[PDB]
Amino acid sequence: SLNENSEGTGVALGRNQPLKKEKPKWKSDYPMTDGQLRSKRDEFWDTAPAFEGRKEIWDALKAAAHAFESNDHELAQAIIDGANITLPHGALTECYDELGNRYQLPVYCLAPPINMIEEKSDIETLDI
């Protein structure tokens, strides 16, 4: 959806959190080489954690990550949405708290494929 946060309309995507298919955010959506990775990494990094929200809720977020890591999607839903906290996204790597807070979770705690990037799946020699 092109920039849809249910603005001008009461609920659109669904402000409550569906299945957590979303990826951890802070890195390049299309990382190319080391330079591309590192440069865009920092760029997106700037926009990732922002201010934070609630260390009190953090406990639930990491516990949900625990279940979700163990393939327990339902557990993490019952935790996040179980509090009051919700998402129009549907991520375990994101949570929006009732106080107007948002948490954005980097891949370093879930998925490390976006660390090397330039494997021999395509990259060989970036000379041009």
CATH number of the CATH domain containing 68: 1.20.225.20
CB 64 within 8 A of CB 92: yes
The single residue listed with the structure tokens 């327990």 is: 72
Q: Which two tokens stand for residue 86?
A: 């919700």
CA 124 to chain centroid: 30
Domain around 56? 33-110
Q: Which two tokens stand for residue 104?
A: 């954005």
**Paired sense of beta strands 94-97 and 101-104, if any:** antiparallel
Give the contacts of 18 (CB within 8 A, at least 6 positions apart).
Answer: 90
C-alpha angle 50-51-57 in degrees, rounded to nearest 5 = 115
Residue 55 identity: K
- Experimental approach was NMR
